[PDB]
Amino acid sequence: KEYRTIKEVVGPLMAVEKVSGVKYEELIEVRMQNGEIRRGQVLEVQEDKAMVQIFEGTSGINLKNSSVRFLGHPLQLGVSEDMIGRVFDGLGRPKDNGPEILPEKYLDINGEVINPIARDYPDEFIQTGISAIDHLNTLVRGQKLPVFGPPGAGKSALAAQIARQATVLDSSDDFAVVFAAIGITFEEAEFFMEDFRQTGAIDRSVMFMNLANDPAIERIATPRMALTAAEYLAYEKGMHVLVIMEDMTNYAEALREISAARREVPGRRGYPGYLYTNLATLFERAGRIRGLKGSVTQIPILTMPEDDKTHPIPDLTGYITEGQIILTRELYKSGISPPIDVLPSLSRLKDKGTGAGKTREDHAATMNQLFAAYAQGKQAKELAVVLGESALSDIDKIYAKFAERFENEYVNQGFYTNRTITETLDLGWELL
Amino acid sequence: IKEYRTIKEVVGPLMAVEKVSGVKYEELIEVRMQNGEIRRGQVLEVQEDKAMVQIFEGTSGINLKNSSVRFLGHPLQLGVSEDMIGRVFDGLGRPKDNGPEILPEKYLDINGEVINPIARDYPDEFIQTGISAIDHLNTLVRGQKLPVFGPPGAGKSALAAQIARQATVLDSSDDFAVVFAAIGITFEEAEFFMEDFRQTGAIDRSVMFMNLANDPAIERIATPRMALTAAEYLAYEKGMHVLVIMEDMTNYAEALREISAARREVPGRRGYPGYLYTNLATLFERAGRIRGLKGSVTQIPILTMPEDDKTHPIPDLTGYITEGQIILTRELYKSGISPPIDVLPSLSRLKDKGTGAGKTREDHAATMNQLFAAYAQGKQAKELAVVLGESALSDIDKIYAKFAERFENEYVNQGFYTNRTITETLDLGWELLAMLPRTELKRIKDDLL
Amino acid sequence: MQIGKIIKVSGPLVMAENMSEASIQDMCLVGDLGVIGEIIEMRQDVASIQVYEETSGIGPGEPVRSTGEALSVELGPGIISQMFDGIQRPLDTFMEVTQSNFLGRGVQLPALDHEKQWWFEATIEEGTEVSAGDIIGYVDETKIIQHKIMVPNGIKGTVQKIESGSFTIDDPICVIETEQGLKELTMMQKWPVRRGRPIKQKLNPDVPMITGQRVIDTFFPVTKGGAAAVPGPFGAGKTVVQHQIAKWSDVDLVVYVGCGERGNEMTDVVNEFPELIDPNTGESLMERTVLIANTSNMPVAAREASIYTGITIAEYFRDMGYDVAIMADSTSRWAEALREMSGRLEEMPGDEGYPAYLGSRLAEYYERSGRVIALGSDQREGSITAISAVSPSGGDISEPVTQNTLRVVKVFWGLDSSLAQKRHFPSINWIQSYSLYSTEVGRYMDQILQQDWSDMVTEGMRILQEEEQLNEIVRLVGIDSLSDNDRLTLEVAKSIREDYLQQNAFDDVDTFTSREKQFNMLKVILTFGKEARKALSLGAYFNEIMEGTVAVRERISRSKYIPEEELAKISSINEEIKETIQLIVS
């Protein structure tokens, strides 16, 4: 039943009267007086009145001669195995002009919370082919390992590279990739999409593309769309799914904007104050489930502040994540691709992902003292800029040169070279 | 007996009662809960036939329909009697020892009265704290307020207990009482204070108001006022000199923040109530003497020094109000230094009215100034003596540092149970400038005698 | 009985009319789904409820039922060895009853098994006058722990009917003649978790707890009824220290509380803790442990109520005469939950966004631990000892959670990553750690050992603190520039560090060191120091002392591994120490 009872429009918000049976977070359709149809969501419901928000805004609407239909369900994803190779927008609607998907079922994109005793501990090793990660900051299935970087420092290039050369060692059980673009530009999106098509990786990928000029309210739905598809492929088809989301900083900003538009109570830095709730509800959606085959692994991509806080505070993210992968600008100016500063980078779960029966057995030991060559390699030369010519030169003579090699060849793989882990270890020993 | 069954509304710790009359601002209330439980509260606002109250113990479990509010017809008051001496109470003056409830002389508004400016008399007599670093250099005067600033756990509580143990008025026909206010301290710290009071019998000249860390915050706010109302009663109506020790006033500021946020009252300038200073003045101004009366009220607030952090009860903020400082450091306390009072930043602006003949020997001032100066630079000598090395040690500068090291180890480290009378500390101060030849002595007139 | 009706749903806030029979802070089942919520406000008959689960799909017109009680725990046989969430939802039962790996909205399951038969053994006679705390009988609930059945608070009178037998916790096992008539008692009582369970008297915790971990028992001990704070940085072996305390402490029950932790971390806990073996019996520790587990994405009220649920259970077992250790990890996460709940309620922030009552809340929780005389005519003693993890985002003790904790607890065990690098475990910083119980514990240790152990401890600590200063002299000038006494101090300090402080939790013998073994080990260390000092002043050189002492010094370093039955082999070291050095002075 359409309701012809719109009484108030203030900004993107609408007040509808004399409804009954309307539920919180229920989706609506506005049928405008000119025949246009917009999609929306119930944000408050009170006696016989409902307050909704229109995804496309309210510009052009005439209240008296428009109507609202209450669809009787929230934001859902139509899921199917056929989502592999396809490209959608932030709401799961096709962006690739391709054949239509007949969903197996529709799933609430908010998800369920895993019972803690049903969860399984992260175990297997993922070969990103990036030596700087695979060796020092090893990625395990079920982990949440974010990467932080300044703008245009190739962090997105790194993202597409991990998406490219990510695999498991048995590789009997397929590795699917779910990619979520969160409020990025058309050109960034095209980088990801056309790369995915040229390397063929699209054949094992599902893409959710929300652009910098899409409605912020849809930007809020995008990561949950990605993760619902990911959990469906993992726990209902037995797949091992890797989830990449850039840029989560944009997700933080869209949250701030929506909360402002809804005259809510501002928390820290005007950010909604439920950033921990929201980001944790997103990031804790990774892992393994005892008794099921698949897995979900997340790699969020964040813009690092490099300024007066006023960013999606990492401490929040790092408080929920199991590690940090840091890119700095000074490695990008040197031409180092990928520019990972191994020193503040951490993998909270590298331990039981790497070991005997999982990787070559030098791996650990060389890691646990390969940091040390870089630790005292730049402890001399970078610190002693003033005293550089002679202070600590006769002794510790080579500890600079080997650090230069660590940057120049060990970590400067190139954004298009796939280093097998054992190959990486060979380079690691030759550098020593 | 005014009691209504008309609770309309409960939001957090606040309640609205309607269809009332004769209810006054800040009047005390009791909530009679449907389950027999009884909670205390205060009228925060009153308008037409409505009254907004706040419940000290909160509103958890209250059923509005079946509960009632009794309006007691008076504010927070303390029933006073000289029989408070020797007893132990909670923050609201209720007996905490298993003795009897007292029959009050009268009930006093714990906010107190505002002294007429021409009726106040200046502080002018001496008090024996027994801690020489105080009694000598930073003398405490009857009627003064001298705070103690300190680091966490660094014998600060031991100093509180020591002053309360060893406090009296010399050569005086008048009585000396102590009122002790614990503000939001733990059970173990309170047990320390209570039975230390009874091992030394100090309890017998003492009144104790014990507020614990898990008591309601309003009771923290009320505790020092209860203490001071008792103290003023004893002083200005029983003629005694009363020393009032309030341990962890920093906890008091945190309780003020909590109350303000619960009341959505003051947008906190620092999250902190804007009136933290003003409230504190309301307490600190309750010390002094009244001309025409032989009593006296003297205050020693004890605070946790901000651990080099900005958001705290700032010392300088207190510093306008207070009439000095007594600062303790752990850098000295880890050296076994106890009581660890760093004598350089300590100050007692009212010392002259206490450092007087007839209460002290005449050497007091001059002693103090050369002990101070010669330690003052003896330190600098020793600091430079290690940073410049044992090789770069001058003679005059080998002897300046000696005084400093010995001053710490023996002039300040007297121990927490040694009551050094003023006569001692004068002699004992000279005993160590006995190394200092006659050559740098502030006076020369009666260095002999 | 009374069904209220939803009139407003807005995010987590739900307003329901026709609720006048409910009370503030009552728990409610909200909507057709029956999701759990709490009454926070009441205006005439209209209640405002903060809903714990997702409110999506809920709207006006639906029902609301009050449970008639505040957030509570069920206490009775069947609680030991269970894994709960922060509001005592049974996680194992949830999986089988719902046939799902997820916590779905609005499923309602009792915390304990109400169908299970237990053997109640009656131990009180009919006609007896009883009040709260009195033990009427018991149940052998696990292979380790005897569940004592007590008269609930609020019940007083004469035992009229009582017989042993096989009952569920729902069956009336006792009848008591009260001023209000006959009241039936079952084996289960309920208690509201934000209220401390009443006691007869609070006592000073002055009896040392034997953890068997040498650094703690000796230099930073905790008493039964005390509380300790543990910084838990990454890669510092916190989990192994925690297991060590849990299985080796001379307590009766362990209550572990995971407050809103990362899913994978919490999976570690739920997997490893059951594999822990109880030393005395060889059974799993779960036969005397209650575990609460919450992840970051669980309802905030579960994560905020985690510690209160845990400590209410702990108080319940303390009232039985038992000693309990409640371990909370992490209280920083619990404080995150507090902060979020404060933000939802539109409250005015305090320091760093935390509510103004953060300190007060922490104080209520920690003042609920301690040693007590419990209720009951026998006046038995119980204690709760608290071990609380803090984990700041930057890892700092100036941040509000840690500063407020250290305001009210007396023990601090500073775990250190640099110590874990050097393979020094447990990585407890001996310079920054402290225990304000150490004086009182020294008194106790002296009276119990009939040795002068307090002085030995003070001297060992003087040696370690002196080593820290001599190490900087070694930094600025060379090692060769030290006195033979100074060099000896460094060597005896190395012996304290490597032969005493360093403990392998995985070695069968090093994993636990008794009180007596600890005494003999430390006096071996210190007597080497002492006799070598004497021989130094007697003309011998430190190099002659060292080169001539290799073998007995290796017997010193190996003493940690001597079996507890062969303790003389440690004490005899003293003789060998005195003899060799005596022939070194010729």
Residue numbers in the entry:
A (entry chain D): 3 to 434
B (entry chain E): 2 to 450
C (entry chain A): 1 to 586
Provide text from the study.
V1 is a part of an ion pump V-ATPase, which transports cations across the membrane by ATP-hydrolysis-driven rotation. However, the details of their sequences and structures are different, resulting in two different interfaces between the A and B subunits in the A3B3 hexameric ring: a catalytic interface, at which the A subunit has an ATP-hydrolysis catalytic site; and a non-catalytic interface, at which the B subunit has a pseudo-active site, which has evolutionally lost the ATP-hydrolysis or even binding ability. We used computational design to restore the lost ATP-binding ability of the pseudo-active site in the B subunit of a rotary molecular motor, V1-ATPase.
The designed B subunit (De), expressed together with the A subunit in Escherichia coli and purified by Ni2+-affinity chromatography followed by gel-filtration chromatography, was found to form a ring complex with the A subunit (A3(De)3 ring complex). Therefore, we determined the crystal structures of the A3(De)3 complex to prove the nucleotide-binding ability of De. First, the A3(De)3 complex was crystallized in the absence of nucleotide and the structure was solved at 2.8 Å resolution; this was named A3(De)3_empty. ADP molecules are shown as spheres. c,d, Superposition of the computational design model of the designed B subunit (white) and the solved crystal structure in the absence of nucleotides (pink) (chain D of A3(De)3_empty was used because this had the highest resolution data of the three designed B subunits): comparison for the entire backbone (the Cα r.m.s.d. calculated by MICAN33 is 1.48 Å) (c); comparison for the designed binding site (d). The backbone geometry of the designed P-loop was almost identical to that of the design model. e, The interface between chains C and D in A3(De)3_(ADP·Pi)1cat(ADP)2cat,2non-cat.
